Write a protein that binds this DNA or RNA. Structure first.
Ligand SMILES: [Mg+2]
Ligand SMILES: [Mg+2]
Ligand SMILES: [Zn+2]
Lengths: 99, 220, 135, 97, 72
RNA sequence: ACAGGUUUGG
């Protein structure tokens, strides 16, 4: 039986290490008038803006490329015992499954 | 009445009376992003014994104890559904409110994902009706509401002597939940996995209750 | 009726003693289930006092020896060309193949860090991956 | 008995600390061209940390050198020497919008 | 029926409103207990004394403790 | 001391 300690070491998130400028692939799951909720797959979903190039080619279920900046935007302020989580992620659009 | 007590005493003598171990595994929980939590700064103090570590700020949950608590929670959930217990899925989160309500509809149990009213469970004889039947079990799929504060039902259940089975993230307070399960309630795959687990745990319990009643009808 | 107290203890500790006293003359259906399969921790109310002083949390950071090797690749070449796919459970990345080649060459008795580092990059050209050294 | 447990080691991805513009440099009180890049060209006010961006050591030594050069007769006080106006802009303040 | 209650405190509480000025309100502490170890207390506050007593008696049943008594 | 009364719109 494979326990948790062995299956965690072979996780792609462990192989990626820090989330600073990592190239990842994410599949869109919801569409807004101009915003795109792309789930790169780690914990949260990043909100990106529809570019002017091939903006119509972005539909529900499309896989796109991202450069992950931060995994979960959390920070502290004055008089806050905990942090203020944004419940999102930070990522930018580069391409849409160039293959 | 002498034959009806046997129906209730039958499942109490066996450990896995409904065979709930095959419904999931450590790998099935790992594949649903359950082992992932918030950053170290958002860590609640009562999650240090329920955390496995911290991978560059982000904490990791121990899936062994996760699966053990999940086994216990699913057993307690199946027994309530077998004993004809009112199960209420209370979860205030504007991302899967539709999925939770659909799961409750398919299970035949009740749901609550809208604005939780103040005197709902306490002042029930004035909010619901003259004399009502309170939910025998409360299931939490999101302990924290949109204000990042503990829900009201998680305290009202303990105030009205009602058992609670809740998914607690790294920023939730499991001090009052009867059967807590340290996991992730922010991932769509995680919430789908929990919804399906409770779905099958309710379905098998109800079907086995019906089979036991059918057998009781032929007992005499 | 019941006991609406929160800070005293657990719902089991507030219902079993009441039934023992004999006020609640009807036993709740969940009480037998609780007695059959109690949880690991009794649900007693605990107030989360803030941690002051030199005290620190009991959680321990997650770091492996493979991270010390992945740091070299991320400082030398940066992010790999093959983007990560978080949906594939058995997805192997460029840095993962590099650290695998490193730990494989380590068994050959090679103790020089340069010998263990440059030989993996030279061997990856046999598989045919493209590396972009950040200078 | 498990061999895949995390080991209590340091952080390998620990990034180097940010350096000031004069980190590991030698400031002086006679390089008027150097000290003028931190004073306002219209008035001569000494820019602070929020504008310059110097770490705790050089920030005070720059001010001391400026105050020494303003009394010894190396650099004017009421303004900046116009011969050193063509120096590259180091500060982070924009006047003309 | 086996429960027995006792009044522990009675006090005439006043409040300064905008129009009526002094607003005399009766607040009382009422304890309940049967004699087998189960007991509790509550506070009933109202305008009339008979109404405050009734509210305290009705709210004292909801808060019950159990006192472990060695040899009773 | 088994204690109670006495300040104040409270
Ligand atoms: Mg959460
Ligand atoms: Mg006074
Ligand atoms: Zn410096």
């Amino acid at each position: 039986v494979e326990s948790f300690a062995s299956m965690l070491r072979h996780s792609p998130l462990t192989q990626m290490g820090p989330a600073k400028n990592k190239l990842v692939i994410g599949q869109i799951f919801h569409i807004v008038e101009d915003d795109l909720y792309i789930d790169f797959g780690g914990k949260f979903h990043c909100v990106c803006k529809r570019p002017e190039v091939d903006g119509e080619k972005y539909q529900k279920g499309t896989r796109v490329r991202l450069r992950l900046l931060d995994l979960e935007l959390t920070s502290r302020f004055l008089g806050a015992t905990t942090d203020t989580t944004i419940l999102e992620a930070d990522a930018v659009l580069l391409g849409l499954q160039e293959s | 009445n002498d034959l009806r007590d046997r129906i209730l005493s039958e499942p109490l003598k066996h450990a896995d009376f409904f065979n709930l171990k095959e419904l999931f595994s450590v790998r099935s929980l790992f594949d649903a992003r359950v082992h992932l939590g918030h950053k170290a700064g958002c860590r609640h103090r009562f999650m240090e014994p329920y955390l496995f570590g911290s991978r560059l700020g982000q904490d990791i949950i121990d899936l062994e104890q996760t699966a053990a608590h999940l086994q216990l929670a699913l057993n307690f959930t199946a027994h309530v559904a077998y004993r004809e217990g009112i199960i209420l899925f209370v979860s205030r989160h504007r991302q899967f409110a539709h999925l939770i309500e659909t799961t409750a509809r398919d299970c035949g149990e009740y749901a609550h994902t809208r604005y939780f009213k103040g005197g709902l469970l306490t002042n029930a004889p004035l909010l619901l009706g003259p004399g009502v039947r309170l939910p025998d079990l409360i299931i939490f799929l999101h302990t924290l509401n949109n204000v990042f504060e503990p829900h009201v039902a998680v305290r009202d259940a303990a105030k009205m002597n009602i058992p609670t089975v809740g998914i607690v993230d790294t920023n939730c307070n499991p001090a009052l939940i009867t059967y807590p399960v340290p996991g992730n309630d922010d991932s769509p795959p995680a919430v789908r996995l929990f919804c399906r687990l409770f779905q099958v745990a309710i379905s098998r319990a109800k079907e086995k209750r019906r089979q036991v009643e059918a057998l009781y009808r032929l007992q005499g | 009726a019941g006991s609406r107290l929160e800070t005293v203890g657990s719902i089991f500790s507030r219902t079993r003693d009441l039934i023992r006293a004999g006020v609640l003359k009807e036993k709740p259906l969940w009480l037998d289930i609780y007695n059959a399969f109690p949880p690991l921790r009794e649900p007693v109310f605990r107030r989360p006092r803030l941690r002051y002083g030199k005290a620190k949390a009991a959680v321990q950071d997650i770091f492996y020896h493979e991270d010390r090797i992945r740091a070299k690749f991320y400082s030398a070449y940066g992010s790999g060309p093959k983007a990560f796919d978080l949906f594939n459970p058995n997805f192997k990345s460029t840095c993962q193949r590099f650290v695998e080649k490193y730990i494989e060459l380590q068994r050959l008795g090679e103790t020089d860090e340069e010998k263990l580092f440059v030989e993996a990059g030279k061997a990856l050209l046999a598989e045919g991956v493209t590396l972009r050294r950040v200078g | 008995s498990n061999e895949d447990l995390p080991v209590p080691m340091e952080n390998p991805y620990k990034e180097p600390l940010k350096k000031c513009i004069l980190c590991e440099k030698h400031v002086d009180y006679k390089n008027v061209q150097l000290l003028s890049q931190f004073i306002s060209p219209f008035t001569g006010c000494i820019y602070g940390r929020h504008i310059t961006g110097l770490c705790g050591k050089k920030q005070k030594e720059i001010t001391k050198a400026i105050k020494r050069a303003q009394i010894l007769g190396f650099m004017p006080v009421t303004y900046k020497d116009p011969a050193y106006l063509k120096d590259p802009k180091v500060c982070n303040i924009k006047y003309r919008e | 029926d086996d429960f027995d209650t006792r009044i522990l405190e009675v006090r005439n509480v006043f409040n300064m409103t905008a129009k009526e000025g002094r607003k005399r309100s009766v607040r009382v502490l009422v304890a309940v207990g049967n004699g087998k170890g189960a007991a509790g207390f509550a506070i009933g506050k109202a305008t009339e004394r008979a109404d405050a007593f009734r509210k305290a008696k009705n709210r004292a049943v909801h808060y019950l403790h159990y006192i472990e008594r060695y040899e009773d």
